[PDB]
Amino acid sequence: AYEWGVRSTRKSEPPPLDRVYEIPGLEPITFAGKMHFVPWLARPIFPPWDRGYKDPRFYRSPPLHEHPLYKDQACYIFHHRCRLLEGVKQALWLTKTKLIEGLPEKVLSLVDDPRNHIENQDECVLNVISHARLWQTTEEIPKRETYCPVIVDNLIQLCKSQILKHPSLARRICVQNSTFSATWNRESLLLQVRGSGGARLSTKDPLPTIASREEIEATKNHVLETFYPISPIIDLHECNIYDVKNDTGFQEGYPYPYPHTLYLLDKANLRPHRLQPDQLRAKMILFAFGSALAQARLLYGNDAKVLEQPVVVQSVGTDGRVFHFLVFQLNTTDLDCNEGVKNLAWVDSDQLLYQHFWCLPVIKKRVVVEPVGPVGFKPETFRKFLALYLHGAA
Amino acid sequence: ARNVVYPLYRLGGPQLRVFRTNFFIQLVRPGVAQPEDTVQFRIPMEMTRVDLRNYLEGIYNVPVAAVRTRVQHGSNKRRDHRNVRIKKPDYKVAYVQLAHG
Amino acid sequence: ANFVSWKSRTKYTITPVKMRKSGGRDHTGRIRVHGIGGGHKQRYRMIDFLRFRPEETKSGPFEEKVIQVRYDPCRSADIALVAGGSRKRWIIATENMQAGDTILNSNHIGRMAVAAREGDAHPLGALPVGTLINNVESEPGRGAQYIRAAGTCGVLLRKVNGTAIIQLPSKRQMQVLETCVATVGRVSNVDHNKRVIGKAGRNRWLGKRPNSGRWHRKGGWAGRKIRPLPPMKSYVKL
Amino acid sequence: GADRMSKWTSKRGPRSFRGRKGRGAKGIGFLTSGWRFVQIKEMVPEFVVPDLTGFKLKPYVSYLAPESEETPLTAAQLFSEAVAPAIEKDFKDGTFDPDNLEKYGFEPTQEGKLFQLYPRNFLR
Amino acid sequence: MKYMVYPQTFALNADRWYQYFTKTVFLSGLPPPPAEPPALDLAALRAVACDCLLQEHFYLRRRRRVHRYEESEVISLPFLDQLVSTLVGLLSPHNPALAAAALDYRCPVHFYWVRGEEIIPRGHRRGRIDDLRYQIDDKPNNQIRISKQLAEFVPLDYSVPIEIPTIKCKPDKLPLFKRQYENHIFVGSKTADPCCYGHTQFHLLPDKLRRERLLRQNCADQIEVVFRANAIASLFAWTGAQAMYQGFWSEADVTRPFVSQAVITDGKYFSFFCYQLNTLALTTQADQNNPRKNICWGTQSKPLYETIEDNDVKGFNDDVLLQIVHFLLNRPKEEK
Amino acid sequence: GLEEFFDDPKNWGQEKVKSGAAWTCQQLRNKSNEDLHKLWYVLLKERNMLLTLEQEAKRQRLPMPSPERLDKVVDSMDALDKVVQEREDALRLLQTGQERARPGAWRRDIFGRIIWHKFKQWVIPWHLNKRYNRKRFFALPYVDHFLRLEREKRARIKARKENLERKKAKILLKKFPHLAE
Amino acid sequence: KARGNEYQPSNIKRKNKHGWVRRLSTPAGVQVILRRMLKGRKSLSH
RNA sequence: GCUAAACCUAGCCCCAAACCCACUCCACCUUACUACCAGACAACCUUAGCCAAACCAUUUACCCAAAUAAAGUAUAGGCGAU
RNA sequence: AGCUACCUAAGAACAGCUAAAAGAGCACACCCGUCUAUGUAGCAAAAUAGUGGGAAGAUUUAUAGGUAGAGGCGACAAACCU
RNA sequence: UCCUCCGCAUAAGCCUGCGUCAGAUUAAAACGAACUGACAAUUAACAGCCCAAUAUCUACAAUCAACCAACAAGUCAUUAUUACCCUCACUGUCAACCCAACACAGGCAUGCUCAUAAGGAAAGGUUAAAAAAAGUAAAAGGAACUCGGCAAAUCUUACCCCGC
Ligand SMILES: [K+]
Ligand SMILES: [K+]
Ligand SMILES: [K+]
Ligand SMILES: [K+]
Ligand SMILES: [K+]
Ligand SMILES: [Mg+2]
Ligand SMILES: [Mg+2]
Ligand SMILES: [Mg+2]
Ligand SMILES: [Mg+2]
Ligand SMILES: [Mg+2]
Ligand SMILES: [Mg+2]
Ligand SMILES: [Mg+2]
Ligand SMILES: [Mg+2]
Ligand SMILES: [Mg+2]
Ligand SMILES: [Mg+2]
Ligand SMILES: [Mg+2]
Ligand SMILES: [Mg+2]
Ligand SMILES: [Mg+2]
Ligand SMILES: [Mg+2]
Ligand SMILES: [Mg+2]
Ligand SMILES: [Mg+2]
Ligand SMILES: [Mg+2]
Ligand SMILES: [Mg+2]
Ligand SMILES: [Mg+2]
Ligand SMILES: [Mg+2]
Ligand SMILES: [Mg+2]
Ligand SMILES: [Mg+2]
Ligand SMILES: [Mg+2]
Ligand SMILES: [Mg+2]
Ligand SMILES: [Mg+2]
Ligand SMILES: [Mg+2]
Ligand SMILES: [Mg+2]
Ligand SMILES: [Mg+2]
Ligand SMILES: [Mg+2]
Structure with missing residues (x-):
């Protein structure tokens, strides 16, 4: 088979050893005593050198197999950069969860009452879009690495203005730079989710359970869809040096220990560096499951069992224009088997807040065809965003 | 010190010490208006602004707050009678600001 | 350099x-x-x-x-x-x-010949005679070196003494061991040879520089030559 | 058209050249990621300045001073003045052996000393 | 070619020079409170402030070593981000304006102006008049913009018996360096944004200007200078940019004052400032007979806490937190 | 303080400032190392002051008062260096026997010349030092002819110089014919 | 068109083409230095 | 009357004799004259041609270890030039 | 091979109008150099004025590197290689 | 009064090359000085100067990136474990400037200004011959000029040869 790496680019082989070395009982006269190369003396054989002390800028790590945390069994790690080939279907299998299309009626009813609507909601949201896409910087056309984080921050700020109507909204904070870890087994495969990036909306109170005990028991019939010949662990980081860490990201005693929403961004400027919609939704499911599992392992121990009190975690994933909404309920920690009570995930996909934005006027033959500003604004998208925020408070 | 070899430092080694320094400096009158707290020097080329701070504080007990330096080019334009260029030497200028008002 | x-x-x-x-x-x-x-x-x-x-x-x-x-x-x-x-x-x-x-x-060669599906990779011994193949290797495990261009295909002619005779796109026969793996079907882009460059510039986009302007008198090499198909090339050692 | 005769300095050449060449100042640290310079305190020369209070020697010497003959110090003279007296005294006492040469001040090796004579590892 | 004025500066006594460039008189203390004709929960505000302090310092687990040189960006910067975010949410009932305010994170603020003239010393332009141009490129860690202007602290013609300091040498000796590039006047958003007025700015001093390092360089008396210089330059640029968004400039001086507030901190010590812009007529021509002066009020920096031992905040200072709340409670006067 | 960079304020404007002699090697050889260490800084501050005055004299386009003061301080400081160096050299010889503080070796360079290569300090051994191994400490045969030409150039110069001296000695006897003895 | 301006100075080019290191990189270049040394040139190389 | 004119030294040439050969500190093979880091590349291999032969094609003296002499002899060679 | 021929690495520039598809047209910047006059020890060892060809392309262009004379390079003009 | 062909800045190049004082040396003219001697000067935030190891990861252009349609198929991305407590050094910074033997009507990349807020002066004085150069206007005629409508003016018809 074709071998990669042409020989001319490979390290040259050591030069032929001087034949004086072959002769037994003969001591070669080399240039080592001279401390420099000469063509007419033999090449010295130098013994291996060891610095003998610690120099951090010239450190060399030990061989991989000799690391203390090296294990023969591989742990497949899903981190913020992992892009699943099969998208949600792969995530559904890994987390032993059943998918329901659309958000829960409990959540969506919160914004059906016009008393919960923000004052001048449509105008307020439109200004947020215009700020992020146009007025933000000194540059004519803000880039996605710029407006995507800001559009999410300002929308959360808009929702946070409702502390007046709902005093319970003062019991939550938006935390940055938090990370979490959870390990579990699926069909004898060791899996780990390491969550990082985005914003963690943290509450003092746990989110109400969504599904009744009757729906949780009705998931026993559901069969997880398989996708032979692709393995469930494709696109995961196969690691052989790891610790079985279960971490919520905070030390004991943190006033806001409960994860409420996980805001995940896909802000890369280049399209090939942005997750596809299905891949982003898969990341949301795994991150929501990871946060929920870390909470369950903390509160209810490391045992494998159907949870008497399900853990509910939400996630909002966006690239700045398209929004995805997830409500995840962790019903069980007995994940190694494919049969039994399954977790539940409510997913509302591909919710366009706006179709397009014109930063400059479109002038054809000295006539302004399109004005600057958002095109195709959908207020329903923000209504779902507000409903998820209001969940657990209003 | 100048025109001497500095002992090589490695992590965890002794402090480098100079006992008889051969750096000599001359305090000069500024050619342009300067702030009241600013003192101008012409120092050796190999002397750093860090050296001058410790040099002025250690030998003269002058409290220094800031030190800035620049390298002045000496003119190489003049010509001797053989039409050979004569180099006015380059020199380093330092600007020392006094500390406690 | x-x-x-x-x-x-x-x-x-x-x-x-x-x-x-x-x-x-x-x-x-x-x-x-x-x-x-x-x-x-x-x-x-x-x-x-x-x-x-x-x-x-x-x-x-x-x-x-x-x-x-x-x-x-x-x-x-x-x-x-x-x-x-x-x-x-x-x-x-x-x-x-x-x-x-x-x-x-x-990699399985069975008593009976398989039903060849386009795009499947089988050993030549396992394919029916007359199957259109591509991406053929000269020796087992060497990797495909033949019939790789757009629209190209070979045909399995014979299977004798653990060897396979295939016709190359140039029409020259090629004997190989029956364990050499090939792919069934023709290569993609069957209409590649119908493309029209259209203008000199497009050849420049493809990384091709113009021909020399020097006029060369044609010699004895030129002119139609009707030659017999070369003898079957064999990679099996007996 | 270039000036071959003039000294090559950091003022000449493009931006990359001008920033790589220096004026002979000894380094006091290293660059880390982001071009962040890390100053090492041990690499900065520390001026050991003595206390000059009550010091009686002045920049110049009085002209009414008797001339003396110049006698540069030698290894022999230093040995006779510093080492020979102790060796002569122990010789009379009757207890002298090569094993005790370290007692008289001989250093078999320079390694392990803070100030090593060869290779010299200290500044003037 | 224009001077690059850095609000956060290593230059000694830069506050005095910045007063000259901006024609700003500095006054110790905060502005005189206006005598004119809901309950504040101090326990709740203190709790969240301590919760934000302990989160960054203790509770939040860091995957990577936090080195001393990274502490400002890794620890202090998230603190000030969250502290400003939670307080404005909690204080919306007391201050309705906050609910509709725009909260920016590290958004540029630019101001360009002309102050003074010089005679070109050298070259083919020697002997000709050249304006002294200045540019401030600032990045406040946080800031709050509102759609209605805050009330003036004092009258537009307010006079003080305090002369603005003068410089007897070139600005280059501060030191200050010249460069040529785009002249930007920017309040944090483009002119189309309705939130064109400034409420409060929150600044975090960089590691280069840390208290511990100033004491090591014999610059103990520059600790307060660094706060004052950053306040004067930042708020002059912000209020100046705000006035020019309303159409005012050197030849059309402001007809009303433009005020703003700043909170300057290094993560532990907090200093509070108020700035009133009374005049943009800073050119030689427009300042010839201009009695107006810009005013800046400032307090001495005070520690918000003493130490943080494990999960306990030692010596929390309620006065410093109260001062932060008072600025956030400022609101425009409601018209009849 | 900064006043030490200037002479006594009473001497400002005086045409001459009287000074003593420069320290001699023998006088300094009687002093302890600690005394010589203190004297170095006493001489250093005088040197800085005199260098300060010399520059200001040029700035004012006036003669420097008593310029020999600087020459004396430089001679004193050179004598102090020599005394300290002699003591260190004697100690190095006794304890090590090495005539030089800095290690080195006689080497032939790429041009065929014999040079004393002063060693430098490194953290890694020489056989691993990429830059060091790029240097050529040997000469190839093509250098041989150039060495001969250089030798012959030296011989020509020496021959002309010797012949000229003999010519001059004869011109001398012609002018003064009484030097036969 | 008009000639005479063939020299387009570049310190990088000058040093790379005619520098000391370049000269010493080949025996012919070393001999260049040896000839200039024998003639007594003040400038052995760029 | 201007411009000029005039000069005797500097040194140099050829032989003889004699073998020859440097050094303060610091810097210098990377962009030489650049304090301070992981490399490993390494030297040898017939001179040609002008020119002469009245072109040119084989051929055409070039210190190689004692001045002289043997001797421009033996000998070589388009048996020509040499 | 700092000019120039071709190439390699990674950069940069191209208004307005028409058509809106373009080795498309008009037309700046920019590249080129058709015709005439001037100039001919000139401003210039190839230029100036006007007039012209091209100007989103096989375009133009800054930077570093590569190919060397029994050779290179060449949309062959025996071009170009200080 | 009149020009604006520019201008300012960066890069590259250059290297003190119209700052002060003192000299009457001089600018293709001229006592200001780019020439001489002396004395001054450019101050880092801009820029240059960067990075511990091993394994592992990286299918989905750009074009307001959204519709739409493409080919010549494209400049920007990690994780795992180990190691790591420290701090602001060094260098460029001037000018009327470079490549063209010149204080050369030539050559010279990028940003901004799009006609200027920046930068500049076509006439040493006089006279008002010829010849010469660059322009403007011209009775009647309108290519009769000439190798040719070259040039100028105006601004258009049809055709042929060759080469797509
Ligand atoms: K001939
Ligand atoms: K090249
Ligand atoms: K220059
Ligand atoms: K293809
Ligand atoms: K010209
Ligand atoms: Mg500097
Ligand atoms: Mg190809
Ligand atoms: Mg062809
Ligand atoms: Mg042809
Ligand atoms: Mg030339
Ligand atoms: Mg060029
Ligand atoms: Mg002949
Ligand atoms: Mg002939
Ligand atoms: Mg080239
Ligand atoms: Mg390329
Ligand atoms: Mg265009
Ligand atoms: Mg075209
Ligand atoms: Mg065209
Ligand atoms: Mg060509
Ligand atoms: Mg031809
Ligand atoms: Mg021909
Ligand atoms: Mg910087
Ligand atoms: Mg400049
Ligand atoms: Mg050109
Ligand atoms: Mg002007
Ligand atoms: Mg004129
Ligand atoms: Mg004229
Ligand atoms: Mg005239
Ligand atoms: Mg007429
Ligand atoms: Mg006719
Ligand atoms: Mg006609
Ligand atoms: Mg006629
Ligand atoms: Mg015509
Ligand atoms: Mg044609």
Whole structure:
């Protein structure tokens, strides 16, 4: 088979050893005593050198197999950069969860009452879009690495203005730079989710359970869809040096220990560096499951069992224009088997807040065809965003 | 010190010490208006602004707050009678600001 | 000169690799091949020509799913991203290969001949006589070196004494061991040879520089020559 | 058209050249990621300045000073003045052996000393 | 070619020079409170402030070593981000304006102006008049913009018996360096944004200007200078940019004052400032007979806490937190 | 303080400032190392002050008062260096026997010349030092002819110089014919 | 068109083409230095 | 009457004799004269041609270890030039 | 091979109008150099004025590197290689 | 009064090359000085100067990136474990400037200004011959000029040869 790496680019082989070395009982006269190369003396054989002390800028790590945390069994790690080939279907299998299309009626009813609507909601949201896409910087056309984080921050700020109507909204904070870890087994495969990036909306109170005990028991019939010949662990980081860490990201005693929403961004400027919609939704499911599992392992121990009190975690994933909404309920920690009570995930996909934005006027033959500003604004998208925020408070 | 070899430092080694320094400096009158707290020097080329701070504080007990330096080019334009260029030497200028008002 | 081949990568990947143009120069910096230069920048997608490469810890026949069929700037034929188990790789696409298809990479030679599906990789011994093949290897495990261009196909002519006789696109016969693996069907882009360049500029985009303006009198080499097909080329040692 | 005769300095050449060449100042640290310079305190020369209070020697010497003959110090003279007296005294006492040469001040090796004479590892 | 004025500066006594460039008189203390004709929960505000302090310092687990040189960006910067975010949410009932305010994170603020003239000393332009141009490129860690202007602290013609300091040498001796590039006047958003007025800015001093390092360089008396210089330059640029968004400039001086507030901190010590812009007529021509002066009020920096031992905040200072709340409670006067 | 960079304020404007003699090597050889260490800084501050005055004299386009003061301080400081160096050299010889503080070796360079190569300090051994191994400490045969030409150039110069002296000695006897003895 | 301006100075080019290191990189270049040394040139190389 | 004119030294040439050969500190093979980091490349291999032969094509003196002499002899050579 | 021929690495520039598809047209910047006059020890060892060809392309262009004379390079003009 | 062909800045190049004082040396003219001697000067935030190891990861252009349609198929991305407590050094910074033997009507990349807020002066004085150069206007005629409508003016018809 074709071998990669042409020989001319490979390290040259050591030069032929001087034949004086072959002769037994003969001591070669080399240039080592001279401390420099000469063509007419033999090449010295130098013994291996060891610095003998610690120099951090010239450190060399030990061989991989000799690391203390090296294990023969591989742990497949899903981190913020992992892009699943099969998208949600792969995530559904890994987390032993059943998918329901659309958000829960409990959540969506919160914004059906016009008393919960923000004052001048449509105008307020439109200004947020215009700020992020146009007025933000000194540059004519803000880039996605710029407006995507800001559009999410300002929308959360808009929702946070409702502390007046709902005093319970003062019991939550938006935390940055938090990370979490959870390990579990699926069909004898060791899996780990390491969550990082985005914003963690943290509450003092746990989110109400969504599904009744009757729906949780009705998931026993559901069969997880398989996708032979692709393995469930494709696109995961196969690691052989790891610790079985279960971490919520905070030390004991943190006033806001409960994860409420996980805001995940896909802000890369280049399209090939942005997750596809299905891949982003898969990341949301795994991150929501990871946060929920870390909470369950903390509160209810490391045992494998159907949870008497399900853990509910939400996630909002966006690239700045398209929004995805997830409500995840962790019903069980007995994940190694494919049969039994399954977790539940409510997913509302591909919710366009706006179709397009014109930063400059479109002038054809000295006539302004399109004005600057958002095109195709959908207020329903923000209504779902507000409903998820209001969940657990209003 | 100048025109001497500095002992090589490695992590965890002794402090480098100079006992008889051969750096000599001359305090000069500024050619342009300067702030009241600013003192101008012409120092050796190999002397750093860090050296001058410790040099002025250690030998003269002058409290220094800031030190800035620049390298002045000496003119190489003049010509001797053989039409050979004569180099006015380059020199380093330092600007020392006094500390406690 | 200081020429260093860009072909230094040692580990297989599906990430497009930055490649450097030669201009028809060799390592000495002198022109070795005329008519090469410029053209659009291109990235190299590493093609796996060994269709039967079981995963590290696996063995025997295995299946793969076609993820995408796409344009390849470095070759005439289209290429297909295939995934099986936890591995993804680029391969040469067949005429009717499309996303969502499943392909079978087997090394099994059975008493009976298999029903040949386009895009499947089988040993030549396992294929019915007359099957249209592509991406053939001269020796078992060497990897495909023949019938790789757009629309090209060979035909399995005979199977004798554990060997297979195939007709190459040039029509010259080729004897190989029956264990040499081939792919069923024609290569993608059957209408490649019908493309029209249209203008001199498009040849420049493809990295082709104009011909010399020097007039060369034609010699005895020129003129139609009717020669017999060369004798069958054999890679089997008896 | 270039000036071959003039000294090559950091003022000449493009931006990359001008920033790589210096004026002979000894380094006091290293550059880390982000071009962040890390100053090492031990690499900065520390001026050991003595207390000059009640010091009676002045920059110049009085002209009414008797001339003396110049006698440069030698290894022999230093040995006779510093080492020979102790060796002569122990010789009379009757307890002298090569093993005790370290007692008289001989240093078999320079390694392990803070100030090593050869290779010299200290500044003037 | 224009001077690059850095609000956060290593230059000694830069506050005095910045007063000259901006024609700003500095006053110790905060502005005189206006005598004119809901319950504040101090326990709740203190709790969240301590919760934000302990989160960054203790509770939040860091995957990577936090080195001393990274502490400002890794620890202090998230603190000030969250502290400003939670307080404005909690204080919306007391201050309705906050609910509709825009909260920016590290958004540029630019101001360009002309102050003074010089005679070109050298070259083919020697002997000709050249304006002294200045540019401030600031990045406040946080800031709050509102759609209605805050009330003036004092009258537009307010006079003080305090002369603005003068410089007897070139600005280059501060030191200050010249460069030529785009002249930007920017309040944090483009002119189309309705939130064109400034409420409060929150600044975090960089590691280069850390208290511990100033004491090591014999610059103990520059600790307060660094706060004052950053306040004067930042708020002059912000209020100046606000006035020019309303159409005012050197030849059309402001007809009403433009005020703003700043909170300057290094993560532990907090200093509070108020700035009133009374005049943009800073050119030689427009300042010839201009009695107006810009005013800046400032307090001495005070520690918000003493130490943080494990999960306990030692010596939390309620007065410093109260001062932060008072600025956030400022609101425009409602018209009849 | 900064006043030490200037002479006594009473001496400002005086045409001459009387000074003593420069320290001699023998006078300094009687002093302890600690005394010589203190004297170095006493001489250093005088040197800085005199260098300060010399520059200001040029700035004012006036003669420097008593310029010999600087020459005396430089001679004193050179004598102090020599005394301290002699003591260190004697100690190095006794304890090590090495005539030089800095290690070195006689080497042939790429040009065929014999040079004393002063060693430098390194953290890694020489056989691993990429830059060091690029240096050529040997000469190839093509250098041989150039060495001969250089030798012959030296011989020509020496021959002309010797012949000229003999010519001059004869011109001398012609002018003064009483030097036969 | 008009000639005479063939010299387009570049310190990088000058040093790389005619520098000390370049001269010493080949025996012919070393001999260049040896000839200039024998003639007594003040400037052995760029 | 201007412009000029005039000069005797500097040194140099050829032989003889004699073998020849440097050094303060610091810097210098990377872009020489650049304090301070992981390399490993390494030297040898017939001179040609002008020119003469009245072109040119084989051929055409070039210190090689004692001045002289043997001797421009033996001998070589388009048996020509040499 | 700091000019120039071709190439390699990674950069940069291209208004307005028409058509809106363009080795498309008009037309700046920019590249080129058709015709005439001037100039001819000139401003210039190839220029100036006007007039012209092209100007999103096989375009133009800054930077570093490569190919060397029994050779290179060449959309062959025996071009170009200070 | 009149020009604006520019201008300012960066890069590259150059290297003190119209700052002060003192000299009457001089600018293709001229006592201001780019020439001489002396004395001054450019101050880092801009820029240059960067990075511990091993394995592992990186299919999905750009074009307001959204519709739409493409080919010549494209400039920007990691994780795992180990190691790591420290701090602001060094260098460029002037000018009327470079490549063209010149204080040369030539050559010279990028940003901004799009006609200027920046930068500049076509006439040493006089006279008002010829010949010469660059322009403007011209009775009647309108290519009769000439190798040719070259040039100028105006601004258009049809055709042929060759080469797509
Ligand atoms: K293709
Ligand atoms: K002939
Ligand atoms: K080249
Ligand atoms: K210059
Ligand atoms: K010209
Ligand atoms: Mg500097
Ligand atoms: Mg190709
Ligand atoms: Mg052809
Ligand atoms: Mg042809
Ligand atoms: Mg020339
Ligand atoms: Mg060029
Ligand atoms: Mg002949
Ligand atoms: Mg002939
Ligand atoms: Mg070139
Ligand atoms: Mg290329
Ligand atoms: Mg265009
Ligand atoms: Mg075109
Ligand atoms: Mg055209
Ligand atoms: Mg060509
Ligand atoms: Mg021809
Ligand atoms: Mg011809
Ligand atoms: Mg910087
Ligand atoms: Mg400048
Ligand atoms: Mg050009
Ligand atoms: Mg002007
Ligand atoms: Mg004139
Ligand atoms: Mg004239
Ligand atoms: Mg005249
Ligand atoms: Mg007429
Ligand atoms: Mg006619
Ligand atoms: Mg007609
Ligand atoms: Mg006629
Ligand atoms: Mg015409
Ligand atoms: Mg044609």
